[PDB]
Nucleic acid binder design. Structure first.
Lengths: 403, 545
RNA sequence: CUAGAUCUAGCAGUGGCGCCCGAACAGGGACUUGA
């Protein structure tokens, strides 16, 4: 065993985040599982020697009813980025997104078969809470590779390469990606054949005794949602003003936008319930704008060093929207999806999309209060990784993006 | 005895070296306590080489006996490496219904835990003569944390030997009890006393065990009930800011059991007043407020202890002005506890948003106290709540609930249509001003030429447009389809705020509620969109340049 | 180390009521330059 040593950012400070309240229904299962987790020699009780602490909670994933656990290394990752970005980095292939379908996997359990540097265990502090402040939290420390982290796989890739080579050597057409405890795969063949190959890969992983006991995904169907405008004949002054405002708001997004021919009929003040048949010039500008918007954005790129942002709004009846961008007005992808359950599922899907496309977790902007989400988001979670988040007030301009 | 935890210092630091003046009557006092602590076997005396300093500051506390001893670590707490804080307090309602209850206090428990020798050097207790504290000293940053950690790790074996027994520990109080008879109860109490003396603790046999109801930081713990410490209030006429703060704290601490407490009208008195002697007049509003509070506090009431088997229900009694209330009872009339929520997350808000925030806070409180969420019974129908959170721009979800018909109720005085209607009229309006004069001007317009303008006084552009739409609505009919040039008015209107702080928006909503229907839209400026540019140029008189 | 008229005093850890400052986002307004 060679536990490579690693630390946080130079002259930085370990994480000292608090722990939001938990429910007894989940704390019981957390304690029950931590009993065996410690019996197995994975952790050890400690004292207040270290002020570091990490948020913890339980979940109920799909395909089972057990109460699995995880860790929130958001701050640890934000502070140790450079470590895995320079020391132990990996490439981001792009052809995997063009495949017909893929199937997400989970190999987090295999990480516990390798201890970690003792000098670094001090940064793996995680304290379970207690109800009614009955007894102080039973502190612990991950003496092995923890989950929900990207440094453990960054260092385990050395052995994962040899663990995977025998399978990909026989199936070169298949492509594999590794972002976190969850594993990916590339499949461009029959779906039945894809599942047979997945079973073969499971058996391959089990070969050397390294046991590793949504479901599927189809990225080929995802395409940029073209901004659609109304197509009718009766354009009252209300609809005319609505369209003018929409076009003006889009102008700052699409440089090649014009409202000249549409700004002429507005010169004539009138009520909002009267119908007005536009002339050919108005229809000409309408057709020009339609031809312009239907075309995707030309002049955008992706920076593997910059950050990521992806807003999200709500319309009604589960008609959710979403966008992605690095800088303001720089759109990279759109789509659709058709209350907390819906939002959780949507963010889960969009994170999977960003992973399979760009292989990085963005920073969402949820239009909801802080306590509400922070409290009711864990109950309806199914994945193992947690991205960042924030909150913002939705103005009456992004809602006009679609119905 | 126990397992002492090592302790280091911050990076690149050492002990603090600081030279104050003491009196003479407190001398023999410090010598007596120092001798008792040294001869007892707690503190040593090695100050020939150690060039450190830890001054002393005696003081006479309540129950005047003499000037007792303290220690100053103000300069060492920052030098010390930040330690882990855990005990950020339990609630009486978060306990269980146990028959055999008891408590186990301890004296000088702090000094009952030696310290690592590598750190005892940093306790130069000069006065001379020095006495290095070999045990947990007072004022030290990591004293309570190490105390509770030692207590937990030493009582662990007892927990493993008697899992059926409950132990709600604390800084120094050990709340213990079960539903067993007194016999084996006292037997297990003696077993615990022996297991504790195994580590060198103290516990007598005539302490406050049958003396209770207890006194728990202002609480009263009874066998099958509980309540706050007996609270009282003055009966005078004048009120000073000091007394205002004092009585506000008292009534807010007592409201957790006493329902129907108002502090809004009584808290508004603090607006602007910051001195420590200025007197204020009790407006008839706050006068009747305090009178009703006193009348309600004229009768005693006690709580109960939550039963894990049975569930817990909630309820709310709205009274207007954001002075919401709520209780929690497992059975009718058996209110476990109560609270209050009147915070203002922005002056612009409505009743449904306040209700959502209140239920969220209640859920969080129940989770942190009891560990789950109760079933709520709110005064609102399902269809209205549904329509609201479906026509909103957020996700306001709540757990299972139901409706209760107990006025006052919750409703929406008005709605907003997403499409204009015939028979109405359009009003292109706008309002602005200058940064120096602020004498803005705005009016309204119609299709029949019915227009009128009025000026403003000391108001910003936002308030200017607000007063513009006010004047426009004051002369309009019932239904209308208005357009604006800024996002402020649209954002304030679409939120359907049934209450706010600025009297302007209050009058807005007062005049709007009478309207049967209303419609609003928005279009930006700098583009010449219909009457927008026209009214902007009309009002441009001496406002821009 | 600080406060009060050289003399006297002034201590910290938790839960609340009430105020001030800094950081980030949103809206608004001006100075220089060019088309």
């Amino acid at each position: 065993i060679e536990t490579v040593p690693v630390k946080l950012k130079p002259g930085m400070d370990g994480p000292k985040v608090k722990q939001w309240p938990l429910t007894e229904e989940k704390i019981k299962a957390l304690v029950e599982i931590c009993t065996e987790m410690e019996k197995e020699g994975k952790i050890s009780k400690i004292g207040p020697e270290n002020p570091y602490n990490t948020p913890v909670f339980a979940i109920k994933k799909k395909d089972s009813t057990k109460w699995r656990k995880l860790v929130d290394f958001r701050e640890l990752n934000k502070r140790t980025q450079d470590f895995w970005e320079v020391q132990l980095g990996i490439p981001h292939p792009a052809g995997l997104k063009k495949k017909k379908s893929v199937t997400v996997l989970d190999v987090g359990d295999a990480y516990f078969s390798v201890p970690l540097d003792e000098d670094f265990r001090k940064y793996t502090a995680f304290t379970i809470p207690s109800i009614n402040n009955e007894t102080p939290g039973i502190r612990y420390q991950y003496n092995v590779l923890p989950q929900g982290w990207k440094g453990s796989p960054a260092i385990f890739q050395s052995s994962m390469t040899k663990i995977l080579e025998p399978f990909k050597k026989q199936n070169p057409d298949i492509v594999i990606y590794q972002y976190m405890d969850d594993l990916y795969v590339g499949s461009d063949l029959e779906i039945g054949q894809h599942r047979t190959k997945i079973e073969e890969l499971r058996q391959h992983l089990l070969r050397w005794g390294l046991t590793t006991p949504g479901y599927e995904l189809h990225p080929d169907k995802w395409t940029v949602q073209p901004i659609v405008l109304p197509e009718k004949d009766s354009w009252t002054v209300n609809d005319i003003q609505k369209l003018v405002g929409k076009l003006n708001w889009a102008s700052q997004i699409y440089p090649g936008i014009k409202v000249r021919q549409l700004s002429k009929l507005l010169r004539g003040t009138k009520a909002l319930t009267e119908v007005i048949p536009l002339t050919e010039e108005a229809e000409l500008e309408l057709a020009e704008n339609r031809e312009i918007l239907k075309e995707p954005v030309h002049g955008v790129y992706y920076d593997p060093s910059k950050d990521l942002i992806a807003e999200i709004q709500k319309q009604g009846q589960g008609q959710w929207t979403y966008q992605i961008y690095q800088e303001p007005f720089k759109n990279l992808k759109t789509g659709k999806y058709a209350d907390v359950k819906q939002l959780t599922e949507a963010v889960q899907k969009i994170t999977t999309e960003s992973i399979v496309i760009w292989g990085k977790t963005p920073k969402f902007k949820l239009p909801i209060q802080k306590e509400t989400w922070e409290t009711w988001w864990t109950e309806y979670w199914q994945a193992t990784w947690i991205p960042e988040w924030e909150f913002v007030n939705t103005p009456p301009l992004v809602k006009l993006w679609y119905q | 005895p126990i397992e002492t935890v090592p302790v280091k210092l911050k990076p690149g630091m050492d002990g603090p070296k600081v030279k104050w003046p003491l009196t003479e009557e407190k001398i023999k006092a410090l010598v007596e306590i120092c001798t008792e602590m040294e001869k007892e076997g707690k503190i040593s005396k090695i100050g020939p080489e150690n060039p450190y300093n830890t001054p002393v500051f005696a003081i006479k506390k309540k129950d005047s006996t003499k000037w007792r001893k303290l220690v100053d670590f103000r300069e060492l707490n920052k030098r010390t490496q930040d330690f882990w804080e855990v005990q950020l307090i339990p609630h009486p309602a978060g306990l269980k219904k146990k028959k055999s209850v008891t408590v186990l206090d301890v004296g000088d428990a702090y000094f009952s835990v030696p310290l690592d020798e590598d750190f005892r050097k940093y306790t130069a207790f000069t006065i001379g003569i020095r006495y290095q504290y070999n045990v947990l000293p007072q004022g030290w940053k990591g004293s309570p944390a190490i105390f509770q950690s030692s207590m937990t790790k030493i009582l662990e074996p007892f927990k493993k030997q008697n899992p059926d027994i409950v132990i709600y520990q604390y800084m120094d109080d050990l709340y213990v009890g079960s539903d067993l008879e007194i016999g084996q109860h006292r037997t297990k109490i003696e077993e615990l006393r022996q297991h504790l003396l195994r580590w060198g603790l103290t516990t007598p046999d005539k302490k406050h065990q049958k003396e209770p109801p207890f006194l728990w930081m202002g609480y009263e713990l009874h066998p099958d009930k509980w309540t706050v410490q007996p609270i009282v209030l003055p009966e005078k006429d004048s009120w000073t800011v000091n007394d205002i703060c004092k009585l506000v704290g008292k009534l807010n601490w007592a409201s957790q059991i006493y329902p129907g407490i108002k502090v809004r009208q009584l808290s508004k008195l603090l607006r602007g007043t910051k001195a420590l002697t200025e007197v204020i007049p009790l407006t008839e509003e706050a006068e009747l407020e305090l009178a009703e509070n006193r009348e309600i506090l004229k009768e005693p009431v006690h709580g109960v202890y939550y039963d894990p088997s049975k569930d817990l229900i909630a309820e709310i009694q709205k009274q207007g002005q954001g002075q919401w209330t709520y209780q929690i009872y497992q059975e009718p009339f058996k209110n476990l506890k109560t609270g209050k929520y009147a915070r203002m997350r922005g002056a612009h808000t409505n009743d449904v948003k306040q209700l959502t925030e209140a239920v969220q806070k209640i859920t969080t409180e129940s989770i942190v106290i009891w560990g789950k969420t109760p079933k709520f019974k709110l005064p609102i129908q399902k269809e209205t709540w549904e329509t609201w959170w479906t026509e909103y721009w957020q996700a306001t979800w709540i757990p299972e609930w139901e409706f209760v018909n107990t006025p006052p109720l919750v409703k929406l005085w008005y709605q907003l249509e997403k499409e204009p209607i015939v028979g109405a009229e359009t009003f292109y309006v706008d309002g602005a001003a200058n940064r120096e004069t602020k004498l803005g001007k705005a009016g309204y317009v119609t299709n029949k030429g019915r227009q009128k303008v009025v000026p403003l006084t000391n108001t910003t552009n936002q308030k200017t447009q607000l007063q513009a739409i006010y004047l426009a609505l004051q002369d309009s009919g019932l239904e209308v389809n208005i357009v604006t040039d800024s996002q402020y008015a649209l954002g304030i209107i679409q939120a359907q705020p049934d209450k706010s702080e600025s009297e302007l928006v209050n009058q807005i909503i007062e005049q709007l509620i009478k309207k049967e229907k209303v419609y609003l839209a928005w279009v930006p400026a700098h583009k010449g969109i219909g009457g927008n540019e026209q009214v902007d140029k009309l009002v441009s008189a001496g406002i821009r340049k």
